[PDB]
Design a protein around this ligand. Structure first.
Ligand SMILES: CCCc1nc(C)c2c(=O)nc(-c3cc(S(=O)(=O)N4CCN(CC)CC4)ccc3OCC)[nH]n12
Ligand SMILES: CCCc1nc(C)c2c(=O)nc(-c3cc(S(=O)(=O)N4CCN(CC)CC4)ccc3OCC)[nH]n12
Ligand SMILES: [Mg+2]
Ligand SMILES: [Mg+2]
Ligand SMILES: [Zn+2]
Ligand SMILES: [Zn+2]
Lengths: 422, 425, 51, 57
């Protein structure tokens, strides 16, 4: 001590308090180690899933056949001979009627759907304008093919039909006038991965069982997961089709994709309906003019409200098919609800909703005329006024509705007759 | 906000300092309440990633139908069955003990499809006589050894065939070298099982590239980087319902086997073998002076520490058994290994921009017969000679190893003679 | 880490502790070692710890 | 995005209250109050009303 005198009580208490504080403050350095281990473990487990949902060096020789015609690996070829080698592989847009409203994919193998999805990009004339590579495009399509699960309904077969309908709207319904090419590309490539890695249960079962999804996100639990996984896939070299865009264009495309993917949730459609109903009505006041064209495509909020409605009309497009396809699709869509009923009956010991338990197996048609009346009759009406060329869809629903109605009534009589006589 | 003093006097200069130091401290203290949320999000992201991994390496409803073909013979699904009912189906489908000669030292696998190996593997679990004693449900066994099959990657050398060969060699040692006498059944269950998962998720690069590339593996672990990654993945696989073949065990046995499995898995790192090699020779020498073979059993089967040193050596004697097979398989396995070495060399030269060492250079692919010879002298020639002096049933391995060394040295001499001849002019 | 935290918390209070020299030593927290380090002791080499 | 749309489309009105020096809006979502004369009576409020005995002044 600096006075020449020995330590005493008043210099014991001070240095005892100092060391007490220093002893308590060792909580922070441990959490540093825990963080630096959790982060690395997360990185390892996230790099393990990228090997299983990616197209490796073989199995890409089932589309790009470079070994037999040239004798060299795909990454050694040039931009030419690659367009040439895939020119004869892809189907033709006329034979399969890719851009019609009645396309049916029941008699098709999963490998053909990949080669039609690849063709869709060539039809829009987007490959050359933005200088996207070929290998990256083909690998991206095959990886998206492998990324879906194998559950009954929400498989790759549902991921192709919701992209083909949007291509048909953008080309046959003549909605491409309002949008530039970049936004068209973003919408087409964000319609394919809208329901990716879908477990098979809606947003309520995720909150009831306290799944880890229900804690990381707070609202619209599954859509944010779909978006995050899709963007994670898009950020890998040899799978990135946005290699040749500057910063501004890349940011704009990402923002548009983000807005598109989260708008396919039914809980955000019931509240954003009147705005669309007003945008449609204000279009008539520019009378005797087909040159209003979204005020010559300078407005930005309206171009971001039309897109959400386009997505939520593409998502439910299955109801507007011919009867011979809807009849088969309805059972597939009911099977998932029936399967979720059993899980929530056993794991949680709770009585399911009447639409989920198998015991009302004969009550299916009735519910199917409620849904049509409630959710999916407004949209196809309003678009029918916004443009006329997409009228053939509006007829579709109507026809289907009638049939369902008739069937339900028959069942009623069967239930009505037996109760009275007994 | 503070609303009234107890004395009666208004607030003054001292009270402002007293009640301002407290708020400064509490304002500074929010770092912990931020770190809390960051950790609570990292944990959830890790759990989601683990579940996504788990989905892709399990057996769906339509995949196990290729092994036990229920849903045709019976109307019920595999889950709705009785234990004795499934045994009748399993008996007629599995290969016999003597069809594929899985009791020999010369068993070659490249004449069988990747589906046969699974059935042979689950046959081995019946040969030991262990399914009845501990009552492992018979669906879980099939589902597990199918998930392990799909767990390996698809690369040149470290694929499912290597993982089956190691386990087959270990079973052969247990049931033909008579090393079964020293160990009970429970300590052989967890050796045969730990032979199937020793290289479960191999990327294709050794431990040095991991340090020289700053892979996230090299920061989580510090020593024996890869060998500790194969252990936590295996213990994650066998830690869930429908894949836990250890559920009918009680607490003590479960703890024993889990403690006994990590030693076996980590002992396959070559660097550990060089350091703790001498201690095995002392046991070998102590075995000699005893009077009879039978008396030695009652002494060794009691001491615990000495048995572990023998298990951790059988694992290395098995992990590189591919050098003792006849000269029709070695001539191909050598090239298979060389392919992976050349691929790692190419990655090293392309990505990190350094010069590969002569071992991994694709250009100098004519001196391969020489290097291999050195390997036989450097590592293999000891483990097998010691085991040959220990037991007498393990001699064919040694003589076949000598023959292979002779062949490789002859090839090396021919190559060197040709090279010297070319330089004459 | 712990080493930096103590070396930033003890350097700021030199003046308030009027002392000529002071020192801090840090112990090691490794309770139980691995399996491959215990073995040389239980087999008759490297006699056990005495401190 | 789905909240800024109504403002830009004439459906609602822009905010007009006070603002924190970094732009945020001033709304309290919890109020912990202590009483220390007579009774301890600790309390927590999940969402304070417009007229609490603290925020009213
Ligand atoms: C999975 C829901 C979206 C969907 N796509 C299609 C093609 C269909 C279909 O054919 N039928 C139904 C479908 C919808 C209902 S609903 O109207 O009760 N419905 C209200 C909204 N909630 C969510 C917020 C779901 C339940 C009831 C039964 C249904 O199908 C039974 C076969 N839903 N559906
Ligand atoms: C780690 C390789 C294990 C292995 N298994 C087999 C069947 C083989 C084989 O036939 N040949 C080799 C093999 C081993 C060496 S080595 O002696 O240089 N060797 C020293 C030890 N270090 C430790 C990481 C590795 C390199 C050299 C060449 C080798 O094979 C070339 C095809 N290695 N090998
Ligand atoms: Mg969805
Ligand atoms: Mg290994
Ligand atoms: Zn969908
Ligand atoms: Zn191995």
């Amino acid at each position: 001590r600096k006075d020449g005198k020995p330590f005493d009580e008043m210099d014991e208490t001070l240095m005892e308090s100092l060391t007490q504080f220093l002893g308590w403050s060792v909580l922070n350095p441990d959490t540093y180690e825990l963080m630096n281990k959790l982060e690395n473990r997360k990185d390892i487990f996230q790099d393990m899933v990228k090997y299983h949902v990616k197209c490796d060096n073989e199995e890409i020789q089932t589309i790009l056949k470079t070994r037999e015609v040239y004798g060299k690996e795909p990454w050694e070829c040039e931009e030419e001979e690659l367009a040439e080698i895939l020119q004869g592989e892809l189907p033709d847009a006329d034979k399969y009627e890719i851009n019609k409203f009645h396309f049916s994919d029941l008699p098709l193998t999963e490998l053909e759907l990949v080669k039609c999805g690849i063709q869709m990009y060539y039809e829009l004339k987007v490959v050359d304008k933005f200088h996207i590579p070929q290998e990256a495009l083909v690998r991206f399509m095959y990886s998206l093919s492998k990324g879906y699960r194998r559950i009954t309904y929400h498989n790759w077969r549902h991921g192709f039909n919701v992209g083909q309908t949007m291509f048909s709207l953008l080309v046959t319904g003549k909605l491409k006038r309002y949008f530039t090419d970049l936004e068209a590309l973003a919408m087409v490539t964000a319609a394919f991965c809208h329901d990716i890695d879908h477990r098979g249960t809606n947003n309520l079962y995720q909150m009831k069982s306290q799944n880890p999804l229900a804690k990381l996100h707070g609202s619209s639990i599954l859509e944010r997961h779909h978006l995050e996984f899709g963007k994670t896939l898009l950020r890998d070299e040899s799978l990135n089709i946005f290699q040749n865009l500057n910063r501004r264009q890349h940011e704009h495309a990402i923002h548009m994709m983000d807005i598109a993917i989260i708008a396919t949730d039914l809980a955000l459609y019931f509240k954003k309906r009147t705005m669309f109903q007003k945008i449609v009505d204000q279009s008539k006041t520019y009378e005797t003019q087909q040159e209003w064209t979204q005020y010559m495509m300078l407005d930005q909020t309206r171009k971001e409200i039309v897109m959400a409605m386009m997505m939520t009309a593409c998502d439910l497009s299955a109801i507007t098919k011919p009867w011979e396809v809807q009849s088969k699709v309805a059972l597939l869509v009911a099977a998932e609800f029936w399967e979720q009923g059993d899980l929530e009956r056993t794991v949680l010991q709770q009585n399911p909703i009447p639409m989920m338990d198998r015991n009302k197996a004969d009550e299916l048609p009735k519910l199917q005329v409620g849904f049509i009346d409630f959710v999916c009759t407004f949209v196809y009406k309003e678009f029918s006024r916004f443009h006329e060329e997409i009228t053939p869809m509006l007829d579709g629903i109507t026809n289907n509705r009638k049939e369902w109605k008739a069937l339900a009534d028959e069942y009623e009589t069967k239930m009505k007759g037996l109760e009275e006589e007994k | 906000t503070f609303y009234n003093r107890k004395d009666g006097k208004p607030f003054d200069e001292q009270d402002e300092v007293l009640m301002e130091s407290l708020t400064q401290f509490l304002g500074w203290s929010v770092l912990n309440t931020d770190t809390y949320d960051k950790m609570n999000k990292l944990e959830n992201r890790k759990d989601i990633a683990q579940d996504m991994v788990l989905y892709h390496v399990r057996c769906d409803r339509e995949e196990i139908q290729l092994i036990l073909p229920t849903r045709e013979r019976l109307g019920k699904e595999p889950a709705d069955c009785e234990e004795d009912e499934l045994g009748k189906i399993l008996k007629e489908v599995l290969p016999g003990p003597a069809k594929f000669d899985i009791y020999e030292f010369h068993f070659s696998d490249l004449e069988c499809t990747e589906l046969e190996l699974v059935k042979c593997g689950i046959q081995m679990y019946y040969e030991l006589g262990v399914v009845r004693k501990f009552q492992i449900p018979q669906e879980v066994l099939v589902r597990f050894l199918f998930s392990v099959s799909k767990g390996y990657r698809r690369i040149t050398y470290h694929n499912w065939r290597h993982g089956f060969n190691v386990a087959q060699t270990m079973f052969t040692l247990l049931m033909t070298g008579k090393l079964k006498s020293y160990y009970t059944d429970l300590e052989a269950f967890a050796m045969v099982t730990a032979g199937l998962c020793h290289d479960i998720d191999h990327r294709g690069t050794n431990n040095l590239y991991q340090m020289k590339s700053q892979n996230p593996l090299a920061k989580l672990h510090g020593s024996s980087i890869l060998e500790r990654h194969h252990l936590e993945f295996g213990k994650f696989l066998l830690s869930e319902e429908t894949l836990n073949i250890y559920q009918n065990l009680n607490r003590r046995q479960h703890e024993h086997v889990i403690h006994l499995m990590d030693i076996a898995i980590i002992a396959t790192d070559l660097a550990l073998y060089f350091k703790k090699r001498t201690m095995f020779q002392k046991i070998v020498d102590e075995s000699k002076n005893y009077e009879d073979r039978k008396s030695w059993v009652e002494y060794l089967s009691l001491e615990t520490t000495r048995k572990e040193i023998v298990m951790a050596m059988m694992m290395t004697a098995c992990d590189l058994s591919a050098i003792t097979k006849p000269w029709e398989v070695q001539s191909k396995v050598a090239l298979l290994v060389a392919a992976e070495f050349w691929e790692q060399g190419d990655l090293e030269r392309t990505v990190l921009d350094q010069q590969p060492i002569p071992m991994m250079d694709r250009n100098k692919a004519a001196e391969l017969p020489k290097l291999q010879v050195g390997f036989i002298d450097f590592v293999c020639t000891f483990v097998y000679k010691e085991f040959s002096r220990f037991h007498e049933e393990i001699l064919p391995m040694f003589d076949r190893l000598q023959n292979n060394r002779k062949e490789w040295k002859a090839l090396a001499d021919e190559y060197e003679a040709k090279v010297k001849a070319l330089e004459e002019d | 880490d712990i080493e930096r935290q103590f070396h930033k918390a003890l350097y700021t209070v030199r003046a308030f502790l009027n002392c000529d020299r002071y020192s801090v030593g840090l112990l090691d927290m490794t309770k139980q070692k691995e399996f491959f380090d215990v073995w040389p002791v239980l087999m008759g080499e490297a006699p056990p710890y005495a401190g | 995005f789905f909240d800024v749309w109504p403002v830009l489309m004439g459906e609602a009105q822009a905010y007009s209250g006070p603002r924190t020096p970094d732009g945020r809006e001033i709304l309290f979502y919890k109020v912990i109050d202590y009483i220390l004369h007579g009774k301890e009576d600790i309390k927590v409020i999940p969402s304070p009303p417009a007229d609490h005995w603290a925020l009213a002044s």
